[PDB]
Design an enzyme around this catalytic site. Structure first.
Site, PDB file in Angstrom:
ATOM      1  N   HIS A   1       2.281  15.435  -6.928  1.00 57.58           N
ATOM      2  CA  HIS A   1       3.091  14.271  -7.807  1.00 57.58           C
ATOM      3  C   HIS A   1       4.230  14.857  -8.305  1.00 57.58           C
ATOM      4  O   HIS A   1       4.859  14.012  -8.903  1.00 57.58           O
ATOM      5  CB  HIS A   1       1.932  14.249  -9.079  1.00 57.58           C
ATOM      6  CG  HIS A   1       1.920  15.082 -10.161  1.00 57.58           C
ATOM      7  ND1 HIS A   1       3.087  15.720 -10.743  1.00 57.58           N
ATOM      8  CD2 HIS A   1       0.833  15.576 -10.751  1.00 57.58           C
ATOM      9  CE1 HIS A   1       2.609  16.524 -11.775  1.00 57.58           C
ATOM     10  NE2 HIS A   1       1.193  16.703 -11.729  1.00 57.58           N
TER      11      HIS A   1
ATOM     12  N   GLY B   1       5.745  19.475 -18.816  1.00 57.40           N
ATOM     13  CA  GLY B   1       6.088  20.491 -17.940  1.00 57.40           C
ATOM     14  C   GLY B   1       5.109  21.585 -17.632  1.00 57.40           C
ATOM     15  O   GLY B   1       5.499  22.605 -16.746  1.00 57.40           O
TER      16      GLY B   1
ATOM     17  N   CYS C   1       2.554  21.580 -15.630  1.00 53.95           N
ATOM     18  CA  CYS C   1       1.887  21.026 -14.297  1.00 53.95           C
ATOM     19  C   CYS C   1       2.266  22.429 -13.398  1.00 53.95           C
ATOM     20  O   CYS C   1       3.582  22.856 -13.399  1.00 53.95           O
ATOM     21  CB  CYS C   1       2.300  19.752 -13.552  1.00 53.95           C
ATOM     22  SG  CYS C   1       1.513  18.466 -14.519  1.00 53.95           S
TER      23      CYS C   1
HETATM   24  C1  LIG Z   1       2.879  17.813 -15.804  1.00 57.65           C
HETATM   25  O1  LIG Z   1       3.478  18.769 -16.443  1.00 57.65           O
HETATM   26  C2  LIG Z   1       2.050  16.981 -16.734  1.00 57.65           C
HETATM   27  C3  LIG Z   1       0.964  17.850 -17.363  1.00 57.65           C
HETATM   28  C4  LIG Z   1       0.485  16.815 -18.631  1.00 57.65           C
HETATM   29  C5  LIG Z   1       1.662  16.676 -19.712  1.00 57.65           C
HETATM   30  C6  LIG Z   1       0.878  16.603 -21.118  1.00 57.65           C
HETATM   31  N1  LIG Z   1      -0.073  17.555 -21.068  1.00 57.65           N
HETATM   32  C7  LIG Z   1      -0.638  17.793 -19.564  1.00 57.65           C
HETATM   33  O2  LIG Z   1      -1.371  18.296 -19.086  1.00 57.65           O
HETATM   34  N2  LIG Z   1       1.094  15.861 -15.892  1.00 57.65           N
HETATM   35  C8  LIG Z   1       1.287  14.546 -16.100  1.00 57.65           C
HETATM   36  O3  LIG Z   1       2.025  14.360 -17.227  1.00 57.65           O
HETATM   37  C9  LIG Z   1       1.012  13.544 -15.484  1.00 57.65           C
HETATM   38  C10 LIG Z   1       1.737  12.969 -14.366  1.00 57.65           C
HETATM   39  C11 LIG Z   1       1.149  12.775 -12.886  1.00 57.65           C
HETATM   40  C12 LIG Z   1      -0.534  12.246 -13.026  1.00 57.65           C
HETATM   41  C13 LIG Z   1      -0.874  11.812 -11.717  1.00 57.65           C
HETATM   42  C14 LIG Z   1      -0.147  10.905 -10.892  1.00 57.65           C
HETATM   43  C15 LIG Z   1       1.419  10.860 -11.424  1.00 57.65           C
HETATM   44  C16 LIG Z   1       2.091  12.042 -12.079  1.00 57.65           C
HETATM   45  N3  LIG Z   1       0.599  12.431 -16.248  1.00 57.65           N
HETATM   46  C17 LIG Z   1      -0.678  12.506 -17.205  1.00 57.65           C
HETATM   47  O4  LIG Z   1      -1.343  13.582 -17.120  1.00 57.65           O
HETATM   48  C18 LIG Z   1      -1.106  11.533 -18.109  1.00 57.65           C
HETATM   49  C19 LIG Z   1      -0.290  10.371 -18.506  1.00 57.65           C
HETATM   50  C20 LIG Z   1      -1.013   9.550 -19.501  1.00 57.65           C
HETATM   51  C21 LIG Z   1      -0.989   8.270 -20.313  1.00 57.65           C
HETATM   52  C22 LIG Z   1      -1.644   7.672 -21.232  1.00 57.65           C
HETATM   53  C23 LIG Z   1      -2.870   8.319 -21.613  1.00 57.65           C
HETATM   54  C24 LIG Z   1      -3.278   9.872 -20.950  1.00 57.65           C
HETATM   55  C25 LIG Z   1      -2.363  10.374 -19.679  1.00 57.65           C
HETATM   56  N4  LIG Z   1      -2.288  11.528 -18.829  1.00 57.65           N
END
Ligand SMILES: *C(=O)[C@H](C[C@@H]1CCNC1=O)NC(=O)[C@H](CC1CCCCC1)NC(=O)c1cc2ccccc2[nH]1
Ligand SMILES: *C(=O)[C@H](C[C@@H]1CCNC1=O)NC(=O)[C@H](CC1CCCCC1)NC(=O)c1cc2ccccc2[nH]1
Lengths: 298, 298
Positions: free
Chosen positions: B40, B142, B144
Site C-alpha cells: 500500500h 509511519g 507500517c
Molecule cells: C502506516 O504507517 C499506517 C499505520 C497506521 C497508522 C496509525 N496507526 C497504524 O497502525 N497504515 C495506514 O495508515 C493505513 C493506510 C493503508 C490501509 C490499507 C489500504 C490503504 C493504505 N490506514 C489505516 O490503517 C486506517 C485508516 C483509518 C480511518 C478511520 C478509522 C480507522 C483507520 N485505519
C-alpha cells in the site's frame, strides 16, 4: 496503544562480552579497549561472604581473566579496580563501540536493560530506578554485568550494571563508575533497602498518557493545592510533588488541556476511592515507571 | 520480578530501511538484495479507498521507489508483488543480513515488535497474536513496515509486518509472505476484528506464575474435567484448552505441584468471583499475553 517500550538495543549488544575467573562467569561491557564488569567475578564462593577486594585483586594476573567476545578471545593486558567495577584493558579496541557516555540516573528515571547471559544478550526491557535505589528487574543467575542504558540521537548513556538480588527479589547494582545505587555493598550478606514509595511524577505522566489515548473516565471537575495534594501523597506512600515536578508536566498539561493540579485532584480521588474495578490504559494499578519524557516519546 | 521482555533488536535493526513513493513514506526490511514493504505504499490518497494493486504496480518505475538505508540511497533494480507486500530487488545486498526464517505465528504466540519510523528503529516491545488475528500494538503514523520477530539462537524468525490499525485501536498486518493475519484486506474500508477471545493457555500460565513467584492466594481444593472446563470457558469468551495445551503446561504443573486440571478448576473459580482487589503478580485482571514459555524462561 501505550505500553512499556525499550530502546533498540543493537548499539549495546555489540559491546557485550563474557568474562570468566575460575568457575565464575558473567558479562562485561566492552568500549574501545576497556572491558567493565562487576568486581565480584574475582570472588570464590567462600570469599563472597566478606571479601577484601584489594587483597583478592592483587593476587591475580591478567592471565586469570578469560574475556570472550563471542568466538574471539581477547587478551587482558592490564587491569584495575574502580569502586565495585573491574576495568580490564584489552589488546583489541571494540570496533562496534558506539558514541556513549556514563551517567548516574536519579530515582524515578527509567532506562532499558539488556539482560545478558554468558556474554550473549537474551532480552531487553524497560524499568526504573526505584526511590529506594533498587530496581525491579528480571535477572537470573549469570546476568551480572548486564547494563542499563538510554539512547539519545546516536549516543548510548550507560547508567547501570547489575550486581545482585536482595532477599526481597529486587535488584541492586552500580553506575558505570562502579558506585552502587543505594546503601548496598558487594558482599553476600542479607541487605535491606529502604521502604519504597510510588513515583508520583511518573504516575501523573501516565495519567496524561491515558488521556492522550482517550482514557478520561478518572478525570473530574475538582482541583487541589500542592500542599493539599501532598497530604494525601504522604498517607498513600507517594513521593511528594515539587513545583519543578509540576513544571516538568507543563508540556503534557498543555497538550491535554488539563492543569497539573487538576490531574492531581483526579489522582487524589483514585487513591482515596480506588478505581472501582475499572482500568487505566489497560492497567488496574497506577503505573509509576513511565517518565514524562517516556510519555512524549511514545 | 515478572515482566514482558522483548528479544534484543540488533539483528533486525540492521535490516530496516525507509521506502518512499511520492508523498507516502513507510519502512521496509532489507534482507540480502531484497527489500520487503507493504504494497500500500504505492497508493495515493485517492487510491487507498479501492486500490487495484496490479494496476498501480505496473504503472510504477523502479526509479519511483526512493529506498534509503540510512545515509545511502539504494537503487531498486526490480520489483514484484508477493501477496500484500512488494519485493523490491536492489543493487546491493545488505551485509548485516542475519540468519533468518519466514514463519507464520499462531494465535496466542508472542513476538517482539521493532517500532520503526522513517526507516529508523524507535523502540522494541513484546506482544501476542490474538485469537481474532489482530495484535494490540503501539503503532503511530509511519510505522507500517515495522516487523515482529522472534530469535532462536542466532536465527531471526520474522513473523509480522505492520500494515494498518483497525477502528477499535488494534492492529493488522501480514506475514513475510504478504498473507494477512485474519480476514483483513489492504483497502481503507470498514473492517472490524471479530470478537476477541482470551488466550486461556496464557491465563493459566499467569496463574502458575503467581504460584511460582509467591502469589498463591486463588487456588482451590477442588478439580474439574477438560470438557467441563472448555464448556464454561466458551460462555465467558475464553479459548477452549487443547490437548497440546495441557502438555505445554506440564513443566509448570510439576514444578508447582498443581495439576493442570486443578488450575483449570481454579480458573473457573477466579472466573466467577472477581479478584476482590487482591492483585496477581502485578495486576488484578487476568493477563493473557504471558506464555508458559515465558513463565518458565524467567
Ligand atoms: C502506516 O504507517 C499506517 C499505520 C497506521 C497508522 C496509525 N496507526 C497504524 O497502525 N497504515 C495506514 O495508515 C493505513 C493506510 C493503508 C490501509 C490499507 C489500504 C490503504 C493504505 N490506514 C489505516 O490503517 C486506517 C485508516 C483509518 C480511518 C478511520 C478509522 C480507522 C483507520 N485505519
Ligand atoms: C550475577 O550474575 C548474579 C545475579 C543474581 C543472580 C540471581 N538473580 C540476580 O540478580 N549475582 C549474584 O548471585 C550475587 C552474588 C554476590 C557475589 C559477591 C558480592 C555480592 C554478590 N548476588 C546475590 O544477590 C545473591 C546470590 C545469592 C545465593 C544464595 C543466597 C542469597 C544470594 N544473593
Amino acid at each position: 496503544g501505550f505500553r512499556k517500550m525499550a530502546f533498540p538495543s543493537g548499539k549495546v549488544e555489540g559491546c557485550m562480552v563474557q568474562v570468566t575467573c575460575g568457575t565464575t562467569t558473567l558479562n562485561g561491557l566492552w568500549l574501545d579497549d576497556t572491558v567493565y564488569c562487576p568486581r565480584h567475578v574475582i570472588c570464590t564462593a567462600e570469599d563472597m561472604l566478606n571479601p577484601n577486594y584489594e587483597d583478592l585483586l592483587i593476587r591475580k594476573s591478567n592471565h586469570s581473566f578469560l574475556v570472550q567476545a563471542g568466538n574471539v578471545q581477547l587478551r587482558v593486558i592490564g587491569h584495575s579496580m574502580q569502586n565495585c567495577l573491574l576495568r580490564l584493558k584489552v589488546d583489541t579496541s571494540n570496533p562496534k563501540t558506539p558514541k556513549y557516555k556514563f551517567v548516574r540516573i536519579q530515582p524515578g528515571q527509567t532506562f532499558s536493560v539488556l539482560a545478558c547471559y554468558n556474554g550473549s544478550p537474551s532480552g531487553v526491557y524497560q524499568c526504573a530506578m526505584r526511590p529506594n535505589h533498587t530496581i525491579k528487574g528480571s535477572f537470573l543467575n549469570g546476568s551480572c554485568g548486564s547494563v542499563g542504558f538510554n539512547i539519545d540521537y546516536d549516543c548510548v548513556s550507560f547508567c547501570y550494571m547489575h550486581h545482585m538480588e536482595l532477599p526481597t527479589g529486587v535488584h541492586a547494582g552500580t553506575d558505570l563508575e562502579g558506585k552502587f545505587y543505594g546503601p548496598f555493598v558487594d558482599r553476600q550478606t542479607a541487605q535491606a533497602a529502604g521502604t519504597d514509595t510510588t513515583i508520583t511524577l511518573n504516575v501523573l505522566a501516565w495519567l496524561y498518557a491515558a488521556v492522550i489515548n482517550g482514557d478520561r473516565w478518572f478525570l473530574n471537575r475538582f482541583t487541589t493545592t500542592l500542599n493539599d495534594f501532598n497530604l494525601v501523597a504522604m498517607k498513600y506512600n507517594y513521593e511528594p510533588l515539587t513545583q519543578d515536578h509540576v513544571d516538568i508536566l507543563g508540556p503534557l498539561s498543555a497538550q491535554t488541556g488539563i492543569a497539573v493540579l487538576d490531574m492531581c485532584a483526579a489522582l487524589k480521588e483514585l487513591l482515596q476511592n480506588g478505581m472501582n474495578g475499572r482500568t487505566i490504559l489497560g492497567s488496574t494499578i497506577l503505573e509509576d515507571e513511565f517518565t514524562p519524557f517516556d510519555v512524549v516519546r511514545q
